[PDB]
Structure formats: C-alpha cells, structure tokens
Symmetry: C3
Subunit: 330 residues, 3 copies
C-alpha cells in the first residue's frame, strides 16, 4: 500500500521579549506536532520480508513553505522482517528518535526539551543531534521488552577548516519498553567544526517514563560535550521532568520542567511549560502552550515560537511565551 | 476526504516588444488559469462543524518548477460551520479573493486586470495586494445574498528601513451575491516601505457583474495609494469593463477594456484583450488571448506573458501580445 | 485516471580517487534507476483523442532533497491519438529520450554511457543535451516498426555574452523498433555559449540493439561538437558496446565498454562496467555496479557516484568505483 499523510498545525503566538527586549506576536506553526506532508509505503516480498519507503517534509502554513518544500524530515528506503529493520537515507538518528519520546511536548512548540540543540555553534548541517544525511540505521525487534537501535552516517569527506569528516554520526541506544514502562540509554558521537577547528560532538542521554493511565511521569538527563581536538570544550548538562494526564474524555494537560547547565558560560536556565490539548476528533485538536524561561547570568536562551520568534534574549532575562493553535492530521 | 487536484496550463506566447523594443516569443504558462498542484481535505467533526486544510502551489510547466515547488498559493487550516469559515495560513487576502472574481481573465495571462500590482515598488513580500503571510481570515455565510470577509495578517515586526511592521494586512469586503448579480466593496491597508521609508498601501475596490445567461457584463474600479509616512504618495486609479458570452455549446468569447491612471507619472495606459476558450471536455480546453496595451507619456507597462516576457516596455510604447495554449485540470 | 508513482534508489558507494587522489565513500543515490516522484494522468476526450499531464522530479534520499523538490525531470501537458503525441513543457529532448535507451545502465549510476555530457563547459542550463526548458515535441506512431520524434525548444532570447539564443534546441530522430530489434539515428543542435562566446552544440548519435532473449547486445556511437561562431571547436567522439543477460529467473548481469575520444585535449578515456540486478519482486531489486575508468594523457573524467563523488580525477589517472544498493518502485 502507499499512504499520503500529513499534519497542518498553525497557531497564534506571543513572546514578551526578543533580543532587543521587544515583544513579538504572530502566526506561527507546529506548536503541538510538527507540520508535515509525506508519502510512505510498504510492500510484502514474501517470506516475512517487507520493503518500504518514506518521504516526509515539514510544512510551514504561515508562509506557504516560502523557502521551498523538501523531504528533510525523512527520505528512506528500507527492508524489514523478523530481524528488525534496516533504513537507508536521511532520517532521525536512533538516539534522537528514541530519546525525544520522553519529552511530553514532542520536541516541538515553545514547551519542549531543548537538549538536542547546537550548544556550541557547530558548523555541521545537523549539530542539534536530531537528524543526519547519509544515514544507515538498524532497529532490532522488541524481545521481552528489550530493544536497540544503531546508526552510522557517512561524512563523505565534508571539510570545514581542519575537520575533514564533518557530519559523521555513530550512535545508538539500548532500551526496555513493555507498554507502561519505558527506559532508554543513548550514546552518540558526531564529527564537526567550531570556528573552523575540528570538534567532536559527544552526547549521552538517559530517559525513563511510566504511564499509570491516570497520569504519566517522564524524565530525561543529557550531557552534550563539544570537545575540540586542539583542546577546550563546550559542555552542557540538560535535565527535564514532566507529567501529563487525561482530563475529561477529550482533554490532556501537560507540565514540564527543564534545566540547562551551560558550563562554558557558567550559567543556568530554567524552564516551565504548561500545555493543554483538547481533541475535537481523533485527527483534529485545539491546543495551548504557556511557557516561562528564566536565564541566569550570561544565559541568553529563548523559547522556540516557530514562525514568530525563536531567537535569543538578552543575558539573564526571563521570557514568557504563549501559543494557541489547531492541529489537523490527515 | 482528501483530494489531490491541479491544473497544467502551458502555452506559446509572443510579445512584439520588450524593454529594448525587441520581440519575444516562447513557451509560457498559465494563460487561462494559473497552473497549480494541491491537496485539500475536509473532516466532519459532528454538530455541523468541519475541519479543513488546503495546500496549493503554482506549477511552471515550461521549466519544471526550476526554482523549487512550494505551497505559496494557499497553505491553510480551517474550521467551518453555520458561523462561516475561519482560516489560518498563507492565502489570498479577502479583498483580492472576492474582487478578482470580476476579472473575466481571472487575474492571469496577458489579458487580466492589472490593478492588483506593486505600483510603487514597495519592498514588502506581497505589495501587489493579492496574498499575505501570517493571515487569519473570517468569511461569513451568505444570508439573503449578503456576505462578507475579513482578514488580518501579522507583520511580526518585519523591519525594512523605518518600517517596523512590514507585511501587516487589515482588510475586508461586503458583498451581495444572488447568482446572476454580484457586487462587492473591498477596503484594505498594508504596511510596507518604499525606498526604505515606511509607507501605507491603501486600496479601495468596487466590482459588479450581471450574468444574463447569453452574456455576462463585469466591471471593476480601484484606487491604490502608497502613502509615505513622511509625505508623498504614489496613487493609481484602475478601471475595467468586460463582457463574455458562450459561443456554440463548447466555446466562450471574452472582451475586456482597462485603463490605468498613474498619477505619480501623470500617465495613462489603456488595454484591450480578446479571448476565446474552446472546451474539449469539462477538464481540458484550448484557448487564445490577444491583447493590446497602449502606454501614454511616461507609462511603461507591459503585458504579462508568464514564462516568456512580463517586463516593461519603453515609455509611451504600445505592445501587442498573443498566447495560445491548453489548460488541463485534474 | 491520475497515478502517483516513484522510485527510491539508494546505495553505498566508493571511488578510490577524487581530484586530490583520495578515496571517497558514502551513501548515494540512483545507481540502477534515477530516484523520482511523479504524478501523471490521462483523460479520454472521445473520438480517440486523449489529454495527458506528467509532473516528475528527482529524489535524493541521502539528503532529503535538501536543495528543494522540483519537477525538472518532466512537466508536460499533452494531446495524443492516432496522429501520435504532442507534448508541451520541460522534458527529455527526443534525441536523448530515444538514444539513451541503448545504454544498459540507463544513463545513471557509475556505469553508464557518458556521451550526453557538457564536454565544453557550455554555459546553458542543459548543455549535456538531455532535457530542455520551453520544449515542444512531436512523436509519431510506430508504423511497421518505423517511428520518429521531433522537438523544438525556445530560447526566449536568453543572453550570455555574444549568444542571444541560449537554450534553443532543434532536433529529432528516426528509428526502427520491432520488439527484438531497435535502431535509431538522432541529430540535434543547441545554442549556447562557452566563455561568453556564442557556440553551437551539434550532436549526431547512432544506436542499435538486438534482444536474443537469452542475451541482449547494444551499441551507441556519438559525435558531439561545440563549434564556436568566431572559430574553434571542442569535439568528442563517444562509443559504447554492451551486453546483458538474465541469470536464473530473478537476476540480470550487464557488461558495458565505452571509449571517449576528446579531441580538444588529444586524449582518450576507456571505461568498463559490470553490473548485477537481483529482483526481490517486480518493484524491488538489490544491485551492484563495479566500474573502471582509465584516463589517458590529459583526460580527467570521473565516475558518477551520485551523492558520493561525481567530480574529476587527476590527468591520466585510472579510477575504480563500486555501488551497492536497493531500488524500490511504487
Ligand atoms: C510535492 C508534491 C505532492 C505530492 C502529492 C501526492 C498526491 C497523492 O494523492 C493521493 O494518492 C493516491 C494516488 O492518487 C490516491 O489514493 C488519492 O486519490 C490521493 O489522496
Ligand atoms: Ca522506509
Ligand atoms: Ca509567521
Ligand atoms: Ca482550509
Ligand atoms: Ca518559458
Ligand atoms: Ca504528458
Ligand atoms: Ca522546493
Ligand atoms: Ca551522500
């Protein structure tokens, strides 16, 4: 079968300050789920073997994809069977695919965990550690709850300054998932450059959650270190704890706290986000996100109101943001 | 339901002069309808409420969309019901959506009304007054013929020179539509800049038509004023009258006259366009457009032979153009 | 009917040297068939007349179409019937459409015939002689084996230096095709520029093949001359002979030899490619290509490992390449 699918998630959003201390408001996107358009298919080859493909790109409903539509979210071909699944092509790397599942705000909107970000202003295409070009991944079956994923992305001799392997990824995870309980440990290294100097991006991530039915609790710890070959490092420890709960048959409330300990500037930022999702149907929801981000000292982090304002703020400033929108899946 | 749809409209076209006085001919597009590719869907949410989405982009069949496919024609999500319809996302603004309906050449090809154009070389993304980014619109039901539409597009602090609200749109229309008779009054203001100086783009548009069955008569008047905050204005009055008629069961003839009174250069341009559409089926037509554009004095307007030549001509020159093509809808 | 179709063909690839003499390896694409995504449709208009359209673009699975999706492979509208077929829009020109059919590696991957390439560093959009913007083509029916195709692409006064008709194409072919036997003669001229000086790109191509069932033999000869108006020429004679055979019910082996006699640098390059395709189903195949390219003297040609390395090599160097991949059609 071949399936056309997508999501259009568009919102109004506001932040009280930008890099100049001025408020911003506007029409933005992707507050509850990332807006997307894709095609996927699966073919039974017999003998339990299946071939697949998946082409997916982000949608920007506020500007009609003004910078041009692509398939940067995923563009894979695969084989799958009793051995698991092997995929070739651009995709989420295994470490982000698995560990972002512990973020109650699904790595989008103003609310989400910010650990997967380019903390060091690395010069690679994907120094947020989320996706990779030139990726091969292998995902095992789940046996008795245990499951794992592994990926390698080729650098293809991409060269920036003294780095001649920019974009290489090697990484994977081990996990236990039984339904209500989930826990995962991810480890990855990317090759990059910072200021034209070869640098490793090392990331270790631990996540766990338990779904009690009446509520779900979820936590994530992560250390990301950009270690420059000649010496020096930009190290960040990121922490998150959240809870969600169904409210009355068609609603869901979510609350998440995060802390970002940015060692290179000896500064912390703390974040609290409250969210609500109200389902009008299985495919259509209204939602609201309210977030507060407190930078200390030299920290300049800003909330990610996509399509409105997602830059930084002045050092040590607190920022408040709101998003209210509709998400429609098809 | 989700519907894939589109139009491929490709033509041969000719103009007798360009900005150097040389003829041009070629393979162009979109002479009878704008070529497009889109997806749209509607979901019944119960209780008379519906959710929708619509993603549509222009097609350029002469070059395979060489500059890259996007969804700039419309990228909305909506809710609709007995209250009307609310849409979020890039789209036609209500004033252009409603008032371009009075142009017998459908705001495309060499023939159409040129009132919705960037008369002042405004620096905004959409200073032709046709579409807007970051748009929210509301369309009422039609009650007893009466209907209205309203839109607001956020500027998001887009800054060019002394303008810090570039791209803002506020506008709407009131109308009467009973089938044979249609009349509408539109009013809109956009924020922009001209030469780096903050400028309002003010537009008032009146249109009416009557469909007698054997023929249709249609007219449009418009004043567009770019009023610069420090003083000065580029004002243009635009007028059009046209008629169409079915010819023999599968044909249609169209004739339209327009005048553009460009106050800032004390010059007028007059235009006459004759068109014919021959239906081979409900979805496939052959067509021809013949146009004559007479610039007086300092006027340099040119016919819009998309994909062939759509620039200006030398001051005071007359230009003739022809387009012959096929339009295929799917 | 309207049909969505495509191919995702992604591979691992290696070449032993690049322009610096270093090996390269990576995740690439399109080793067995060019990866693509398209929509096409046909409408019966009655009386044996049909309207069609076809929109197709290349897919780059290794990077998610990072530079943006388009319809550059084909974006046509057509009419067809007992007279043949007329198409308007960007497409393969008739000479490449017909003559590339003699290449056993289908003008893609490391293995294919390289005759359709920009031998002179022409400055036109399509100086490889493969596709054209602004194209009108006519294809006859096949009567008693005989068939022909003709195309004209408008230049639209595209100007580069002293060339004011850049991109013009005039060309066509005559052929005999009866099933097992195929032979074709193509002739074409394009207008271009080299170093800002007007230049004709003249191409004559002869191809033939015979399919014995147990094996197929195929050959191609081509002369491409870039003849500069003020004098001088970059002339290349290109030759290829290949064979293919089914192996055991789901396999196919292919072997092709080519020679490129580059007169402007008095140098030859020779190429040998071995390929295997193993079908897992009618739509899904695994494949491998192994190629050896020997440059003599000043020749610097390189193998085309798309998405890994497709540049040149140092003068007189031999290069080896390998591609192993999966092709999945839908
Ligand atoms: C950027 C280009 C967007 C590609 C849009 C893909 C449209 C697919 O269209 C879909 O596919 C199937 C085949 O027609 C059908 O089942 C459905 O009618 C349709 O929903
Ligand atoms: Ca897949
Ligand atoms: Ca916006
Ligand atoms: Ca909609
Ligand atoms: Ca053109
Ligand atoms: Ca066609
Ligand atoms: Ca694009
Ligand atoms: Ca690659």
């Amino acid at each position: 079968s071949v399936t056309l699918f997508g999501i259009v998630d568009t919102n109004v959003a506001y932040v009280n300050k930008d890099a100049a201390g001025d408020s911003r408001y506007g029409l933005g996107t992707s507050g509850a789920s990332t807006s997307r358009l894709g095609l996927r298919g699966t073919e039974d080859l017999g003998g339990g073997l299946k071939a697949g493909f998946w082409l997916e790109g982000e949608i920007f409903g506020d500007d009609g994809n003004a910078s041009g539509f692509n398939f940067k979210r995923r563009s894979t071909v695969s084989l799958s069977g009793n051995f698991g699944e092997v995929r070739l092509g651009r995709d989420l790397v295994p470490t982000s695919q698995k560990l972002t599942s512990y973020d109650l705000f699904s790595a989008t909107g103003i609310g989400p965990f910010m650990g997967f970000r380019n903390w060091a202003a690395g010069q690679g295409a994907d120094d947020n550690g989320i996706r990779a070009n030139n990726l091969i991944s292998y995902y095992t079956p789940n046996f008795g709850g245990f499951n794992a994923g592994f990926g390698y992305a080729f650098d293809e001799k991409q060269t920036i300054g003294t780095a001649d392997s920019v974009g290489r990824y090697i990484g994977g995870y081990v996990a236990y998932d039984n339904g209500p309980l989930s826990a995962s440990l991810g480890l990855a290294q990317q090759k990059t450059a910072v200021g034209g100097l070869a640098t490793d991006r090392d990331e270790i991530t631990l996540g766990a959650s338990y779904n009690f039915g009446v509520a779900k609790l979820s936590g994530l710890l992560q250390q990301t270190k950009f270690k420059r070959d000649i010496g020096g490092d930009i190290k960040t420890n990121s922490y998150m704890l959240g809870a969600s709960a169904p409210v009355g048959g068609v609603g869901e409330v979510k609350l998440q706290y995060a802390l970002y300990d940015q060692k290179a500037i000896d500064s912390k930022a703390h974040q609290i986000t409250l969210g609500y999702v109200h389902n009008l149907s299985k495919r259509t929801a209204l939602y609201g996100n309210l977030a507060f981000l407190k930078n200390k000292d030299a920290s300049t982090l800003g909330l990610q109101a996509k399509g409105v304002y997602a830059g930084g703020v002045q050092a040590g400033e607190s920022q408040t943001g709101v998003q209210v929108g509709i998400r429609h899946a098809f």
